[PDB]
Amino acid sequence: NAINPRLTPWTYRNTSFSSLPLTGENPGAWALVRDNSAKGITSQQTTYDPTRTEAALTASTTFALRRYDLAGRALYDLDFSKLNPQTPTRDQTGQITFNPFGGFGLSGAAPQQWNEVKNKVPVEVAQDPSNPYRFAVLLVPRSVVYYEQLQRGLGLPQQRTESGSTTGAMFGLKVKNAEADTAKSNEKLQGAEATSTQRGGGDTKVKALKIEVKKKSDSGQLQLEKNDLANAPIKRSEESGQSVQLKADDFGTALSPTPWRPWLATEQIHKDLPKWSASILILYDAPYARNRTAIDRVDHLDPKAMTANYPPSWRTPKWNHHGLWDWKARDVLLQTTGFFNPRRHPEWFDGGQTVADNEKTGFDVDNSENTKQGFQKEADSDKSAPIALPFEAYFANIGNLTWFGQALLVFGGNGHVTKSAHTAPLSIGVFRVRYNATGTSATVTGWPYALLFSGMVNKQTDGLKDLPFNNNRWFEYVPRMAVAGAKFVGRELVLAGTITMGDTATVPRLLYDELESNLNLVAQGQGLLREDLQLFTPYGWANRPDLPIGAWSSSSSSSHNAPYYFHNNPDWQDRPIQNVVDAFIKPWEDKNGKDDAKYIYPYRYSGMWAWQVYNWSNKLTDQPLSADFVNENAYQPNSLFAAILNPELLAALPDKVKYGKENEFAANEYERFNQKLTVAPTQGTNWSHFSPTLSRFSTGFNLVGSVLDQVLDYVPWIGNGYRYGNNHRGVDDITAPRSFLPTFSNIGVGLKANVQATLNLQLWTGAGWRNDKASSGQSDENHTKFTSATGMDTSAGNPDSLKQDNISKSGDSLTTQDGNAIDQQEATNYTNLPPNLTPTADWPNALSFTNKNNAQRAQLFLRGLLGSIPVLVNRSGSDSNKFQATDQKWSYTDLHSDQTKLNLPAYGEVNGLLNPALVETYFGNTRAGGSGSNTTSSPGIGFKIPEQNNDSKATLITPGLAWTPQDVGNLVVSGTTVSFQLGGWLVTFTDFVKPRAGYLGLQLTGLDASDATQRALIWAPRPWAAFRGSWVNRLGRVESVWDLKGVWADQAQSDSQGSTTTATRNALPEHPNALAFQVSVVEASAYKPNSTNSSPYLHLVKPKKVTQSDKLDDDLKNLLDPNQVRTKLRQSFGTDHSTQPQPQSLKTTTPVFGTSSGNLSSVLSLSPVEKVSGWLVGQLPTNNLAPNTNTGNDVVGVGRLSESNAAKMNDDVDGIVRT
């Protein structure tokens, strides 16, 4: 019985592996086969014990391999549970005894510990490049193949409010402003140093805030005689008696709500390796021999082999290289502490959510004496939770075998094997199995990606510069990947997929008494809102996010402690002229690293998103390991990625990584006050040998950031097929002095700025300009006057009652003025400010006024390919709350006379885009209100500026698509290009191996939402379960396969027909893109103008405190479940012409891309940004779905599937046999 017919093909979800073609000396193929009719493991959910589950799965399932020939016939099967193999014999030279007629010499014994590994199932086969008869098969436990049937979800913290107690917070969020403790009122830092109410003034003197940390030479030693960094005059509030605090029992107690925990710890897997681990076995195969089957050995991929090479700083991930001051600063603000806190990242802790709080850090943080807090503890009852590799993360790291010499590499998979709705298990590193020359012994090791990627610089890429990829010597950046594959394009090892960057969304910190007005950012900081994008709520930020608590309150019992700690306002910043830097910085800047005292200068620092990112993220520089601030890590993969690796070093690295003392957090608080960002590696360590592994990397196009924003506007939304640029007719539109404003570009929007205002050019302002008017009143100026931008008419222009200053030119006397421009001339502030600080601000000549930045452009590119950019809405679109078509205007003729007709919120939405433009792309009200057909079929959702006495109670929502950033296909090669499937888009890195300068660098092909079957695939509740792999044809075109039968099975059963649990129970629905968003409350008086400036966006938009009445409505709280939005949108798409047969599988193929496709040299020979935008609009072509007419086609490489290049099938497919 060679061919078991009860078995049928299948595909392993984690790697898209279905089969392996073979050619040359051993032609044919290998394919996975199983009993596809079994149940697996079997709303009244119950607990499954692991042992009994694995027992029943062994007793009720069957897995094998199937061998084919060059003609496509099945030769035999290999059921490891029923096989009885024999280890093969060798000669004196250790070569496997083989002859093309007799087969292999069988010694008459089984492999070692074979009778305990035989029940594990094969999921991956890779052929040896040095021996076409030697294969490496990967085995996993049976319970891992059916883990998706257990459905163990992540929980929310239990709440006492629902809001739809008080404060209006939803989904369990704890938010409560902090108050000062009158008991510790002495612990405020005094501005001491010297050598004017608007500075340290102790009267009218310029004073810097002095921080001093000193030790006793008397008798964790030195006794820390004084620690200014332990001061805490501001403390967390008390609420119903007991203080508010982030506790791990918020999720329930381990045992109606129960916290999420890993199925098996790292320890249990290490202790039952034969049952619970994953194994590699070597296989010898000759299909035309007498003795054809011989199993050489079996090797285990022990998780501890990886966790033993983790950096030492990963043992206590609740700490960082900022010590105690940052711990208390983040704890008071209701945030998580450390770099990898378990409350944000529970998939890598054996405790799950039973440790998801801020306590037990491995250091003393609540001692009675301020001089004993911050000392690393050796007591073991107070040990922390270390970053580990439990069940789900461990099996997320298993896949993608690759040979090179004697080295067998395991790069990981995308994580769909153990992924849940609101979890994100990922690959943390690489496993290696290295064999000796004879193949008679093997060693197993693993290294984290953090270590292998530790030598990245800026000149190693060709796209965006300054991405948050840097790291430091503590390895606080933990790059995790969703791997597509590792392939050899000639001699180059290419690695590709998506990756987590460092966290930039919560870099800015709010003021301590502004939390209850900025609930969204507080949720992002508590780990409750699993959202990596930057949100636009800049009013309540502090001016800079790196100050200890001692600098927060006041010395005069006033408001916030300006000039040190006040409301962020880039209009109130100083200017970096010589006599100002000499007055405010130079008396002190030469004493910081001196006598153990650092100083905060009375210098006004302020800036928008780009300024915060450029100063407190981990952006890339030209020096490696030079990151001074790693804020946190991302929840999900938020960037496209591709890397080239030196394969010779990967097989030559050490087996065990030796870290030094330069890789640990300091033991006492005096030791880290005298720190250095760089320390040379110590003798007897090799952790610096892993750096040269990366030679080049890519994140997509080869474009400069501002040029990427026209490509992004030319890319359609995969939801309906309308481009994000809204057909905006480039620079020739009416929007300057069927078509709408664009989402990502400024070219043609607003006024034509030729600026010299602050520290020529021919750029634009965009939407939300605040130009002052000129003399007559009709002519417009190129700037905003400081006298207009700062006005007290609490006031959003001057909430902290700042005043002007000036410095008389000798370096001397300060202390007041209106700033006469004669002898005092040099005023501390600016005079002409840029005429924009909205989310669309982009000034190449003023960093403090820019909002768009590369770290956000990469995320917007990825989430725009996934079709899941959150939008801000305050109209539910339902009866009596519809967003009418006349509610929005775009013609600059009307906008110049009134700017609130654009409905730009300028508070609460995503940074970097035009929110009305995204509303127009998603829901299409402007293109709906231009015809009688479909009677405004738009669902009527959107945002409209509030009127006389209405407040805006808005929330962020997702359009409803279910593509995640872990939907990564397998990596295929075709010529000198690499390509893989990413959600619904087939990407192709065309200019990464051999960069052809003057080309875009990428090609995109997506699913066409104007075709019925592809549209059903796009809007499927689980569209990545239908992916069956990609492979290259004979002509050089990449083709993908989809199995649509589950899509039809789900379309046949409606579950969310009338679901209202979102608004009634405040639980997160089981949708992959459900996010615990909050409400943003803005009063109508915020959009009124002030007096030479009539712009509603002159100041920042001040929000309103959130109370138990400021909560959402029910009809709007309903849209927090993406299935309701999905229903409304597909109902707008309403039509019923089902195919019959409703094909069971569909096959897509890339079109033919010419030698002139994606070329920029034809237009790069006006600024290059405007040139590329104009070329795109020249190459650019009333309905709910944009028909794919193929005008947006092979001249750029950005195009969708034609009907002819997407072949449907009649019968479904689980596995694909390729010979």
Author numbering: 60 to 101, 106 to 227, 231 to 261, 272 to 277, 280 to 297, 301 to 336, 349 to 830, 848 to 869, ...
From the paper:
M. pneumoniae binds to host target cells by means of a polar structure known as the attachment organelle, and glides in the direction of this differentiated structure at a speed of ~1 µm/s. P1, together with the P40/P90 polypeptides, forms a transmembrane complex called the “Nap”. In the present work, we report the structures of M. pneumoniae proteins P1 and P40/P90 and of complexes of P40/P90 bound to sialylated oligosaccharides. The structural results reveal that P1 (1627 residues) and P40/P90 (1218 residues) present a similar overall organization and topology in the extracellular regions.
The structure of the ectodomain from P1 was also studied by single-particle analysis using cryo-EM. A total of 68,014 selected particles yielded a 3D EM map at an overall resolution of ∼2.9 Å, according to the gold-standard Fourier shell correlation (FSC) 0.143 criterion (see “Methods”). The structure of P1 consists of a large N-terminal domain, with Asn60 as the first residue visible in the X-ray and the cryo-EM maps, and a smaller C-terminal domain (residues Gly1395–Asp1521). The cryo-EM and X-ray maps of P1 are well defined for most of the N-terminal domain with the residues clearly identifiable, in general, in both maps. However, from residue Pro1388 to the C-end, a region that includes the hinge between domains and the whole C-terminal domain, the density in the cryo-EM map becomes weak, indicating that there are hinge-like movements between domains. In the crown there are 13 disordered loops, spanning 117 residues, which could not be built. These disordered regions, essentially the same in the X-ray and cryo-EM structures, are spread over the N-terminal domain surface. In the crystal structure, the C-terminal domain is anchored by crystal contacts and the density is clear and crisp, while in the top part of the crown, with few crystal contacts, temperature factors are high and chain tracing was difficult. Together the cryo-EM and X-ray maps provide accurate structural information about the whole P1 ectodomain, proving the mobility of domains with respect to one another and confirming the characteristic presence of a large number of disordered loops. In the cryo-EM map of P1, the weak density of the C-terminal domain indicates flexibility with respect to the N-terminal domain proving that P1 can experience significant conformational changes consistent with the observations that antibodies that bind to the C-terminal domain can interfere with the attachment and gliding of mycoplasma cells.
